């Protein structure tokens, strides 16, 4: 379960896609947290809609937007207006009850206008 690098030019919107099994994660909410170290924490930046049936509705939180496709099985994260302080390790999480499974490790790179 290694990392996938997503790089985007600073000042533009970065789209991070997280595919998953729509059958396995049926009825599970999704979250996008920022990992600051090897021992955590993965501070939740944004999560999907509180009602899983409305996962298609965009849930904004600062400059990070999240949207989920429960049928097609695709979690889309949007880092609107990239900033150099947004670079780091993140996680795509699938929430079920009290536990949380990791879907994909994402490394956000910021390019200075390459």
């Amino acid at each position, epitope marked *: 379960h290694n990392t996938t690098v997503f790089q985007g030019v600073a000042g533009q919107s970065l789209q991070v896609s997280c595919p998953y099994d729509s059958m396995k994660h049926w009825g599970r909410r999704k979250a996008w947290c920022r990992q*600051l*170290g*090897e021992k955590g924490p993965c501070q939740r930046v944004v999560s999907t809609h509180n009602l899983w049936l409305l996962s298609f509705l965009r849930r904004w939180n600062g400059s990070t937007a999240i949207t989920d496709d429960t049928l097609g099985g695709t979690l889309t994260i949007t880092l609107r207006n990239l900033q*150099p*302080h947004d*670079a780091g390790l993140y996680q795509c999480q699938s929430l079920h009850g009290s536990e949380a499974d990791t879907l994909r490790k994402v*490394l956000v*790179e*910021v390019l*200075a206008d390459g």
Partner: single-chain antibody, 229 residues
Framework: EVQLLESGGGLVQPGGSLRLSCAASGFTFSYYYMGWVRQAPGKGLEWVSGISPSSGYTYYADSVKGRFTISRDNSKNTLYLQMNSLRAEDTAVYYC??????????????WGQGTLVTVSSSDIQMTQSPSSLSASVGDRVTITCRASQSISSYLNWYQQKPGKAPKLLIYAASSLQSGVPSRFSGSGSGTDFTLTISSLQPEDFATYYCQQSRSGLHTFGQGTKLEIK
């Protein structure tokens, strides 16, 4: 395993030029931010420069801006630091350090043993209240660290044994780095932070520094000498 091998140090006259080289192995060098930290002989740590994986972002300190030039070659896994117009103020032991994923809000988890350079013939300050602290084995020591402005909960604590490279203990205000024993603990938010050791050990007698990590200049603290009472 991870190795940060430094080279390119020695003696130089004022106004000379040197090129510090830091060969890296064990980690994907094109993923992490890199940075240089020098330490004057018998003084505290000073953050020098930093660089982005794509080399598009170069952060320099005020004392070395314009004269130093940080660079990297991801194809050869090497970090460079071109030093020009070397004044007598630059006499220090330069350390090569790698940042964990990210730069802002991140921490230096791996350091090089350091190379010696001897010149022969959004600005926040960090102040540690106990400059010289003396305690015995088993005492309860609590070192503090005050910031000039709000730095949220992004502060790091480093332990530097006399004659070796500094090691990372606490990062992100209160997170314990992998490998650090459970005796160390951190706390604090905003502008006041504390480093607490429950019971001291024979290997805990060293120097401890606090480093802020919210702006582009990750300045260190003045230091705290911790020896036997």
């Amino acid at each position: 395993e991870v190795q940060l091998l430094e080279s390119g140090g020695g003696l130089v006259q004022p106004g000379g030029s040197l090129r510090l080289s830091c060969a890296a192995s064990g980690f994907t060098f094109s993923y992490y931010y890199m940075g240089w930290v020098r330490q004057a002989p018998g003084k505290g740590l000073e953050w020098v420069s930093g660089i982005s994986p794509s080399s598009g972002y170069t952060y320099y300190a005020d004392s070395v801006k314009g004269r130093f030039t940080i660079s990297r070659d991801n194809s050869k896994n090497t970090l460079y630091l071109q030093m020009n117009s070397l004044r007598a103020e630059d006499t220090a032991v330069y350390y090569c350090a790698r940042y964990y994923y990210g730069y802002y809000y991140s921490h230096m988890d791996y350091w090089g043993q350091g190379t010696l350079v001897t010149v022969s013939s959004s600005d926040i300050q960090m102040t540690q209240s106990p400059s010289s602290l003396s305690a015995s084995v088993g005492d309860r020591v609590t070192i503090t660290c005050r910031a000039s402005q709000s730095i949220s909960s992004y502060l790091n604590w480093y332990q530097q044994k006399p004659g070796k490279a500094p090691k990372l203990l606490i990062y992100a205000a209160s997170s314990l780095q992998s490998g650090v024993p459970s005796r160390f603990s951190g706390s604090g938010s905003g502008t006041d932070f504390t480093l607490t050791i429950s019971s001291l050990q024979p290997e805990d007698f060293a120097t401890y520094y606090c480093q802020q990590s919210r702006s582009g200049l990750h300045t260190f603290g003045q230091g705290t000498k911790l020896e036997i009472k």
